[PDB]
Curated annotation (Swiss-Prot):
Region of interest (Actin-severing), ranges: 1-122
Segment of the intact protein contained: 55 to 187 of 782
Disease implication from the record: Amyloidosis, hereditary systemic 4, Finnish type: A form of hereditary systemic amyloidosis, a disorder characterized by amyloid deposition in multiple tissues resulting in a wide clinical spectrum. AMYLD4 is due to gelsolin amyloid deposition and is typically characterized by cranial neuropathy and lattice corneal dystrophy. Most patients have modest involvement of internal organs, but severe systemic disease can develop in some individuals causing peripheral polyneuropathy, amyloid cardiomyopathy, and nephrotic syndrome leading to renal failure.
Lineage, opening ranks: Eukaryota, Metazoa, Chordata, Craniata, Vertebrata
Annotated protein name in UniProt: Gelsolin
Residue numbers carrying Phosphotyrosine: Y32
Gelsolin-like repeat spans: 22-104
Organism of derivation: Homo sapiens (Human)
Length: 133
């Protein structure tokens, strides 16, 4: 067994992963682009300058339907580890509505609002923060 947060950074290009109670779950490659507006997604983008230097770009997608407790958590684990990956990296926050140009460029049709989740997909229910009451 091995840690995932530390696994990130094993290949250049762009990688996508979905956070789940601190479990990280690779978004189904079959769909590639589907997103549930309620949780938080983390993406990295290692670009190639001339032919040796590389730059990882951080991009967390928030359908604006996810609580801030989990939203920031992703921006935190994604940002902190980023420093653990390169030390700086780029920071991009997409709160569904005003994304960045690089994000809308790599995700042209990567925008599918699907209310649901992964483990709660069997019951088909979207518990609201009211649960804490």
């Amino acid at each position: 067994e091995h840690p995932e947060f530390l696994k990130a950074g094993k290949e250049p290009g762009l990688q996508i992963w979905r956070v789940e109670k601190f479990d990280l779950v690779p978004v189904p490659t079959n769909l590639y682009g589907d997103f549930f507006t309620g949780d938080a997604y983390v993406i990295l983008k290692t670009v190639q300058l001339r032919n040796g230097n590389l730059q990882y770009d951080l991009h967390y997608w928030l359908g604006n339907e996810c609580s801030q407790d989990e939203s920031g958590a992703a921006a935190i684990f994604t940002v902190q580890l980023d420093d653990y990956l390169n030390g700086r990296a780029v920071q991009h926050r997409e709160v569904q509505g005003f994304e960045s140009a690089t994000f809308l460029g790599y995700f042209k049709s990567g925008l599918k609002y699907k209310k649901g989740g992964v483990a709660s997909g069997f019951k088909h229910v979207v518990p609201n923060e009211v649960v804490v009451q």
